[PDB]
């Protein structure tokens, strides 16, 4: 149940535990949706093969939710008379690891 493909960014090493995933506001909207995610890390049941052997099949996961920035603050300061403050961003829509 544990695979490791890679999206518009590695963000990988999963199977089912839906992994908070980088944005993608074009296919996402698709609530609990289905979509393909190229592989390149075939690790299943103690059997592996090139991430280049893979680059042929893959998987897919249901477009779950839209995590809302998990808090995180950025005190932008310095002795040099320069301050300011902006809170987290990076969310993301969640989605389970549809393995195959």
């Amino acid at each position: 149940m544990f695979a490791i493909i890679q999206t518009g960014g590695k963000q990988y090493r999963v199977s089912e535990g839906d992994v908070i995933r980088v944005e993608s506001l074009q296919g996402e909207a698709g609530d609990k949706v289905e979509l393909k995610a190229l592989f390149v890390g075939g690790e299943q049941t103690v059997f592996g093969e090139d991430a280049g052997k893979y680059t042929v099949q893959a998987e897919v996961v249901e477009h779950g939710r839209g995590k809302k920035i998990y808090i995180r603050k950025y005190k932008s300061g310095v002795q040099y008379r320069r301050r300011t403050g902006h809170r987290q961003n990076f969310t993301a829509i969640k989605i389970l690891g549809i393995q195959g």
Binding site: F2, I4, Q6, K10, Y12, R13, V40, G41, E43, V46, F47, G48, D50, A51, G52, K53, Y54, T55, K73, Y74, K75, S76, G77, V78, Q79, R83
Partner: protein, 117 residues
């Protein structure tokens, strides 16, 4: 046209204060260096803000070595061989593997060594 600013400033401070965990003996409530200490901490975090992601670039660096060598070689070998790759290129996760799934790792470890020599 009275301005008893009052109630207001006080608040603000509270503000920061919060910004005021329970850090070091004092500032603790240091309605100053209180405030200060802040500014500091801040920017800090910042630079830390971007920092980390580095501290990582390395972390894996070793945990990596831990293996990359294990078998018998370094990360200027591997690497080179790796990029000999073609439909498979990654590094991060690689590590946290070699340790997670020995076989898996072990694997590539080969396909690698080879790619190379």
């Amino acid at each position: 046209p009275r301005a008893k600013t009052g109630i207001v400033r006080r608040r603000r401070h509270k503000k920061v204060l919060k910004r005021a965990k329970g850090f070091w003996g004092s500032r603790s409530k240091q309605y100053r260096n209180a405030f200060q200490t802040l500014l500091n901490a801040a920017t800090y975090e910042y630079r830390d803000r971007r920092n980390k992601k580095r501290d990582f670039r390395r972390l894996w660096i070793q945990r990596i070595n831990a293996g990359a060598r294990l078998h018998g070689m370094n990360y200027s070998t591997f690497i080179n061989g790796l990029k000999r790759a073609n439909i498979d290129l990654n590094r991060k996760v690689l590590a946290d593997i070699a340790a997670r799934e020995p076989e898996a790792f072990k694997a590539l470890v080969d396909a690698s060594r080879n790619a190379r020599q």
